[PDB]
Structure formats: C-alpha cells, structure tokens
Amino acid sequence: YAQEKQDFVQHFSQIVRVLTEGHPEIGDAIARLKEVLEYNAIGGKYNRGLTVVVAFRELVEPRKQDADSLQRAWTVGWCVELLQAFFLVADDIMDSSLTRRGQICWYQKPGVGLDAINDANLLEACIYRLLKLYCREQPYYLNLIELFLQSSYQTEIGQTLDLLTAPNVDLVRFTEKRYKSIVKYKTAFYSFYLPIAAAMYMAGIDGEKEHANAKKILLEMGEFFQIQDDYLDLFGDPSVTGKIGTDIQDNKCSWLVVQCLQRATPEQYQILKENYGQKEAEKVARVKALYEELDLPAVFLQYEEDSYSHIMALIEQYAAPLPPAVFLGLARKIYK
Amino acid sequence: YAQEKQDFVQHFSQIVRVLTEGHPEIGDAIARLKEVLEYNAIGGKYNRGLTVVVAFRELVEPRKQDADSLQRAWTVGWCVELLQAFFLVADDIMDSSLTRRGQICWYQKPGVGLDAINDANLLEACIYRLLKLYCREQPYYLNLIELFLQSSYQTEIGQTLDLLTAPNVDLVRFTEKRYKSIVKYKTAFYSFYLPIAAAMYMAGIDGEKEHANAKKILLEMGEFFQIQDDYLDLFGDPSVTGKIGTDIQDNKCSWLVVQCLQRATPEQYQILKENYGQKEAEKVARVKALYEELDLPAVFLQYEEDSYSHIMALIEQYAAPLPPAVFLGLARKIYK
Ligand SMILES: Cc1ccc(-c2cc3c(N[C@@H](Cc4ccccc4)P(=O)(O)O)ncnc3s2)cc1
Ligand SMILES: Cc1ccc(-c2cc3c(N[C@@H](Cc4ccccc4)P(=O)(O)O)ncnc3s2)cc1
C-alpha cells in the first residue's frame, strides 16, 4: 500500500537527473527547470502516479516484470504527476491562490510571479521528454503520447467550462448537468482514466472497447471522488482531512451548492445569494447552516451509498477481462 | 508568393470548423475555443505556416500532390501558426504587453485576464488534435508529433533563458554568447527549423543527417533574422516596417545592447545604465545617440554582408540533396 509509495518517491531523484543534463550555456535554464520540478512535483500524496505502478503490476504476468519494465512504470507514473503539477501551477495563477499542499504557491514566490506560466509549460514538456527517453522503443509509445495529449486537452476544456461558469458569478449557471460535465472533463479523465489507461497500454491492452469499458467505470469513480471532496471541504473534520475548507468564501460550483439550489425555496436562494463568497465567518456560518437545514449531509450519505452500489455494478458488468481488483483497489481508496 | 497566401488563409475556416464540433454540454467551452482561435491565430503575416506549404511543394514530386496531400500541408502549416499563437498569448501575459499585431492583447480584453493562460494551453492542444484528424494514418505522424513537442520544449527553454537574463536587470548578463543562445532556442528552432523539418517529414525525408544538415542552415538564418529584427526595431523606417520600436524603454537583450556593451568605454556603460529602460523620450534619444556614436548601423551592415556570405556557403555545403531553392526562397524573404 505504502512501501510501493517510498519506491515511487525514491525514483523521483532519477527523473530529475535525466531531465536535467550536453549543451553548455542553457545551464542556467536547466538549473531553473530543476527548481521547478522539486518545488511543484513533490509534496502531494502521489495517488495518481502510484495507480500507474499498482495497476501495471496487477495487469502484467510477473514473468514480464524485469527491472527495465518496472522502471518504465515508475517513469510513466511520474508523468502523471508532472501533468498534474502543470495543471496546478497554472490553476493557482488563474484562481489567485495563496497556498497549495500547505506551501506558498510557486507563482507567489518572490521573483517568480507570472514567469510561472513558462514553468508550467516546462512541466508539461517534461512528460514527453520522459516518454521519449524511457519508452520510445516500446510498441505502446505512440499510444501513451496520445493518451497524455488527450488527457491534457480534456482537462483544459473542463477548465474552460469551469471558468465560464464562475467568472460576477451566478447560481443559475450551476446546474447538476454542468457540474457533472466540469467534473468529468476537468478532474475524472486525468485523475482516474489516465493512470489505469496508461497501465493498460503498457501491459499490451490497447483495444478500444476495453479502454471504453474501463473509462465507464473510472469516470464514474471520478464523479464520486469530487462530490465527496466537495462534501468534506465543509463537513470534513479538518484535523482528519488535514484540510480547511474554503469553497464557500470563493463562489465555487461545489456539489453542495448544486443540491442546495435544487432544494431551495425563493427565500433560501436569497440567503445563499447574500452569503456565498463573503469572507466574513458569520456569513460562511450562514451558508453552512442553510445546508444543514436542507439536510445535505443526509443527501450526501444517501448519494454515497447509491454510488457505491452503482460502481460495484459497473465493475461486474465492465471489468472483464481485466482483474476486478484493478478497479476495487481504487474504490477502496475513495469509499470509507 | 502572395496567392499561395490567400489559399493558406482561406483553409483557416475549415481548421476552425473541424476543431469546433458530438458532446452537448461542452458547447460553451467549444464556443470559447472558437473565439480564442479567431482572435489569436489570425492577423499575422503567416510566413512560418506558409513555409510549410511552399517547402512541401518544392520537395514532393508533383505526381504525389493529390488534394488530400495539399490539405495535410495546409493543416500542418496552420499547426505552426497555432504553436506560434500559444507562445505569443502566453508571452504577452508574462511581459505585461498592451498590444500585439496592432490589436489589444487577448489577456488585456475585458473578461479574459489570466484565463488567457488556459486559452493558450488550448491553442497548444489544437495542434495535436489537427495532426491526429488529418495525419494519423500517415507514416510521418509520430515524427510530426515529436517535432512539434520538441519545438515547444526548445522555445520554452529559450524563454526561461530569456526571463533569467532580463528580470532589476543587469547588462553584465547580456553577452554575445547568451544572446545567440536565447535566439537559437526561443526563436530560430520554431521559426526556421520547424516548418522546413515538417515539410521534409511529410515528403518522406526523415533521415537524421539530412535533418541535421537543414538545421545547421536554418538556425543560422534564424540568428540573422532576429538580429536584423533588433536592428530595425530602432533604425527601421516605422512607416515601412509598420512597427514602432520599444526595445529601448523595456531592458531587452537586443543585439544592439550586446554590441554596445562590447564597444563601450566605462563612461559610455554609465550613459547606457542611466537611459536604457526609462520611458522618457529624451532618455530613449540618448541611447540611440550612443548607438550611432559607436556606429552600430555600420557594424550591422557589415554583419549582414558577412551573414549573407556565410548562409550561401552553408547552402552550398549542406543543402543536398534538398533543392537549394528551399533554403534560397527563405533567404530572399529575410535579406534585402
Ligand atoms: C486515482 C486516485 C486514487 C486515490 C486518490 C486519493 C485518495 C485520497 C485519500 N485516501 C484516503 C481515504 C480518503 C479520505 C478522504 C477523502 C478521500 C479518500 P486512504 O486511501 O489513504 O485511506 N485521502 C486524501 N486524499 C486522497 S486522493 C486520488 C486519485
Ligand atoms: C520562416 C520565416 C519566413 C519569413 C519571415 C518573415 C518575413 C518578413 C518580412 N519580409 C519582407 C522583408 C523583410 C522586411 C523587414 C524585416 C524582415 C524581412 P518581404 O519578404 O514580404 O519582402 N517582412 C516583415 N516581417 C516578416 S517575418 C519569418 C519567418
């Protein structure tokens, strides 16, 4: 569970070494690339990247897991983490965030600022450098390049959808349908489909139908993951989650807002209008109080139960011929 | 020369159509992608993209130029233009520019701002969507994906080098060697190598040595192009160039600065220290006056002559077995 993790984090050092070599006077730029890698790619939980390694091992017969194969698996897992780091660095600029991962946002560091835009682009580029360096001779090379490019496009499109929805923001826009759509494109594809799909290609499983089948399970898991995330942001024990929720004083298309708007009287819509996004804590208290009044903790608990049933059904119908454990190991990481 | 251009600009409409389709509720995002394409990809001179088409025609026997081949050529030319548009939109944010192409910078438009970061990423992604849609069945597909990814990486690295060199900027940093290095990575590879290299792959010419040979000529042309650009920014007739120069009141690693620092007394270094980058026109007058005093117009004219000789020598030594006209047509566009 957790020793596989230390191995994953220990490979990081090698990733940075290979990325940060023969050309003299680009030295200074390569030094900066190293600082960008170390600040931004380190310090998460590594679940997405690790999924690549775990799934790879569950998919591949042990007798085709030589040292070089495992190394490619580690490297591709790190590519998922670099993709994520590209997105976060850029998203923190666009949202004007202060911190991430308990640490000052890269762009907020003295002397970085909007130069972080190029830093982020570099993180994106390192994906394709690594795929080339480690995977270019493999039959799935082109498949992995395309999967990463496509994952980027889907995430960017979801970002666009998110930015159109939350500019002067309006709750009319925040429907269930638009919420699911943002989650699918902006979170679920890269977080859940990408890592398993990558493992699948590395293992030789390249059929469109199998990929489509895995995708159906994995995008559904992604939807639940984000909804639970939204729920917890407010109702989570901050000393368990290690996270203090800020969605409310920020005008976010949270799942809670979507359910609240579905369930609200005209009178209640106004109380939400007046309190959602003020940074005063009396106002933040208000919104929460209204969520309780409509028993969104109960709507959620119900949703979670239904979602668990649905996912197990999807695994039953669509897993084969992959081992159900590939999907069940993920489901266990996100249902409690 | 100029009718090939109208055809190139006319294909644009098709590019936008294919990029901006089956999925309902991502409609809003796709509408935004269209506005991003139309604002940012249109309104240049299209020289880089057009080079793809011209070189392709000079390379390919006429009897393998069916309607579909030409269409791929147009599309890949547009991919060069999309790459450029990605870079510009992002660079204008990082530099805090006001205008580009005589038009307000995309990020400066009301309601865009730092959302332009995601817009730029989308422009980048559209490259790979187009390559897939038009070129996926072709034997050079992977070669073009890799060439575009590599061109992006080289340009980003050059950008990093540029940003480290011009933060509180210092003229100590602005050496000839660092100047050439920024130009090579940030401008020459994507502007000059990329379009010809793309044509070459489309024409079936994929050897490393031929690519290396073309690269040698093309990176040298790129160096001259940028140096002439720097020269003209200040000494160009603004009603011929259609451009009013701003390098001086902006602290840029211009070629003029590099030559000036090489040729300056201690006393002259100070006059440059005091005037480079003030927006007052008395101060901008000063710098110019000092450039004339050191006869940089004569250094340039000499440089240009030597550079022409050198390029013709490179074409002689390294063109074959490509038709010299591929390179000479470019040389004619940039020497006067
Ligand atoms: C593909 C993929 C897989 C797993 C995850 C994450 C899991 C997880 C987590 N998991 C705990 C359970 C949990 C608590 C709170 C929210 C979600 C999950 P654990 O598995 O360590 O017991 N705790 C905190 N953050 C995360 S992010 C994300 C993407
Ligand atoms: C690959 C490639 C090829 C060509 C170019 C450019 C050419 C060019 C230009 N050319 C004129 C000449 C010229 C004037 C001023 C500076 C450079 C070139 P023309 O060829 O239209 O007579 N005028 C203004 N801008 C440009 S950008 C850039 C990249």
Q: Within 13 A of B277's CA, how many CA atoms are on the CB side?
A: 15
The answer to whether A46 and A5 are in contact (CB under 8 A) is yes
- Residue B328: exposed, middle, or buried by beta-carbon count in 10 A (0-12, 13-18, 19+)? middle
The continuous run of DSSP H or E covering B104 comes out as strand B103-104
Whether the Cβ atoms of residue A86 and residue A123 lie closer than 8 Å to each other: yes
Q: What residues are paired with B100 via a beta bridge?
A: B103
Q: Which residues contact A74 (CB under 8 A, 6 or more apart)?
A: A7, A8, A11, A53
Q: How many CA atoms lie within 13 A of A260 on its CB side?
A: 28
Helix (H, G, I), strand (E, B) or coil at B100: strand
Please provide the size of chain B in residues.
Answer: 336
* A167 contacts B122? CB cut-off 8 A: no
Q: List CB contacts of A301: < 8 A, sequence separation 6 or more.
A: none
State which H helix or E strand residue B257 sits in: helix B255-263
B186 is a catalytic site residue: yes
Measured distance CA(B211)–CA(B319) in Å, rounded: 10
Question: For residues A46 and A9, is the Cβ–Cβ distance under 8 A?
Answer: yes
Query: Is B37 in contact with B126 (CB distance < 8 Å)?
Result: yes
What residue type is A258 in one-letter code?
A: V
Residues of the domain holding A273? 1-336
A57 carries an active-site annotation: no
* Cis upstream peptide for B323 (omega within 30°): no
Number of domains in chain A: 1
Measure Cα distances from B71 to A187, B1, B140, B313 in Å: 35, 18, 15, 34
* Helices vs strands, H then E, count in chain A: 15, 2
Please, which residues bridge with residue B104 across strands? B99
Q: How far apart are CA A35 and CA B170, in angstroms?
A: 22
Closest CA to B313 of B298, B334, B327: B327
CB B206 within 8 A of CB B143: yes
Angstrom distance (rounded) from CA A137 to CA B90: 34
Terminal-residue alpha carbon distance, chain B: 16
Spell out which residues of chain A touch residue B125, defining contact as CB-CB under 8 Å. Answer: 149, 152-153, 156
Q: DSSP label at A99? A: E
**Closest of A305, A307, A245 to residue A281, by C-alpha:** A245
* Pair of tokens at residue A170: 């309006």
HEC sequence for B69-84 = HHHHHHHHHHHHHHHH
For residue A193, the tally of other CB atoms under 10 A from its CB is 24
Q: Which-ligand-closest: CA of B221?
A: 2
User: CA-CA distances (angstroms) from residue B185 to A23, A75, B76, B219, B278?
Assistant: 12, 26, 21, 9, 28
Q: Alpha carbon of A202 to those of A245, B30, B70, B98: distances in Å?
A: 38, 32, 36, 47
Which two tokens mark B237? 């007739």
Active-site option among B92, B119, B229, B233: B229
Secondary structure of residue A160 in the 3-state scheme? helix
Note whether B157 contacts A94, CB cutoff 8 Å. no
Residue the block writes with tokens 């969520």:
A291
Tokens coding A275:
């309190």
Closest CA to A224 of A320, A323, A319, A302: A302
> String of b and e for A6-23 (b: at least 16 CB within 10 Å)?
eebeebbeebbeebeeee
Element (H, E) at B99: strand B99-100
The amino acid at A130: L
Integer angstrom CA distances of residue B140 from A319, B58, B200, B204, B314: 35, 18, 10, 7, 27
Query: Which helix H or strand E contains B103, and what residues bound it?
Result: strand B103-104
Half-sphere exposure for A114 (CA within 13 Å, toward CB): 16
Q: For residue B131, what are the CA distances in angstroms to A111, A142, A222, B144, B194?
A: 37, 13, 29, 8, 15
CB B53 within 8 A of CB B75: no
Residue A230 is among the residues annotated as catalytic for this protein: yes
| Of residues B24, B39, B25, the one with CA closest to residue B111 | B39
- Give CA–CA dist A326/A56, Å, rounded: 9
Q: Which residues pair with A103 in a beta bridge?
A: A100
B291, B309 in Cβ contact below 8 A? no
- Of the CA atoms within 13 Å of residue A216, those in its CB half-sphere come to 15
Cα B217 to Cα B211: distance, rounded to the nearest angstrom:
10
Give every CB contact of residue A56 below 8 A, 6+ residues apart in sequence: A73, A199, A202, A203
Q: Taking CA atoms, what residue in A is nearest to B110? A: A167
Give the distance between the most distant pair of CA atoms in chain B.
68
Check which CATH number belongs to the domain holding B98 and give it.
1.10.600.10
Distance from residue A253's CA to the centre of ligand 1 (Å): 21
Burial of A212 (0-12, 13-18, 19+ CB in 10 A): exposed
User: Which residues face A104 on adjacent strands?
Assistant: A99
Give the C-alpha distances (Å, rounded to integers) separating B289 from A310, B283, B286. 76, 10, 5
Single-letter amino acid, residue A100: R
- Cα dihedral: B125, B206, A27, B253 (round 10): -70
Coil/strand/helix, residue A229: helix
Q: Is residue A46 a contact partner of residue A84, using CB atoms and an 8 Å limit?
A: no
Cα A331 to Cα A25, A227, A311, B169, distances in angstroms: 49, 14, 8, 53
> Across the strands, what pairs with B103?
B100
- Other CB atoms within 10 A of residue B175 CB: 16
Residue with the smallest CA separation from ligand 1 atom 1 is A48
CA distance B198 to B193: 8
Contact B164 A28 (CB under 8 A): yes
What's the rounded Cα separation, in Å, for the pair A69 and A63?
11
Length of chain A equals 336
Distance (Å) of CA B8 to CA B33, B35, B77, B84, B147:
21, 20, 8, 16, 21
Q: Answer for the pair B77, B195: CB distance below 8 angstroms, yes or no.
A: yes
Q: Which two tokens stand for residue B55?
A: 């070189």
Cα–Cα distance between B336 and B35 in angstroms, integer? Answer: 37
CB count, 10 Å around CB of A152? Answer: 23
Cβ A147 vs Cβ A211: under 8 Å: no
Q: Peptide bond before A321: cis, by omega within 30 degrees of 0?
A: yes
For the question of residue A86 being annotated catalytic, the response is yes
Nearest CA to B165 out of B154, B155, B177, B152 is that of B177
Measured distance CA(B94)–CA(B154) in Å, rounded: 18
Comparing CA positions, the residue from A240, A287, A224 lying closest to residue A260 is: A287
Nearest-angstrom CA–CA distance, B82 and B151: 12
Question: Do B116 and B85 meet the contact criterion of CB atoms below 8 Å apart?
Answer: no
The finding on whether A333 has its CB within 6 A of some atom of ligand 1 is yes
Cβ atoms of residues A191 and A81 within 8 Å: no
- Tell me the C-alpha distance between B190 and B48, whole Å: 9
> CB of A89 within 8 A of CB of A116?
yes
What backbone phi and psi angles, to 5 degrees, belong to A103? -120, 150
Render the burial of A242-271: b for 16+ CB within 10 Å, e for the rest. eeebebbbbbbbbbbbbbbbeebeeeeeeb
Please give the Cα distance from B195 to B48 (Å, whole number).
6
Tell me the C-alpha to C-alpha distance, in Å, between residue A81 and each of A1, A283, B203: 18, 37, 37
Q: List, in sequence order, the alpha helices (H) in B3-45.
A: 3-19, 27-40
Pairing of strands B99-100, A103-104: unpaired
- Strand locations in chain A (E): 99-100, 103-104
Give how far Cα A63 sits from Cα of A51, A57, A66, A73, A134, Å.
Answer: 20, 11, 8, 15, 20
CA distance linking residue B64 with residue B157, whole number of Å: 37
Ligand 1 neighbourhood includes A45 CB (under 6 angstroms):
yes
Residue by residue, DSSP assigns A248-274 as: GGGT---HHHHHHHHH--HHHHHHHHH
Q: Which atom of ligand 2 is nearest to the CA of B229?
A: 16
Q: What are phi and psi of A154, to 5 degrees?
A: -60, -40
Contacts of A235 (CB under 8 A, 6+ apart): A297, A300
Looking at the complex, does the CB of residue A294 fall below 8 Å from at least one CB of chain B? no
**Residue B185 DSSP symbol:** I
B56 neighbors B323 (Cβ within 8 angstroms):
no
Using an 8 Å Cβ cutoff, are A30 and A20 in contact? yes
What does the DSSP 8-state code read for residue A26?
A: G
B149 contacts on A by Cβ (under 8 Å)? 125, 128, 145
Cβ proximity of B107 and A94 under 8 Å: no
Residue B47 CA to ligand 2 center (angstroms) comes to 7
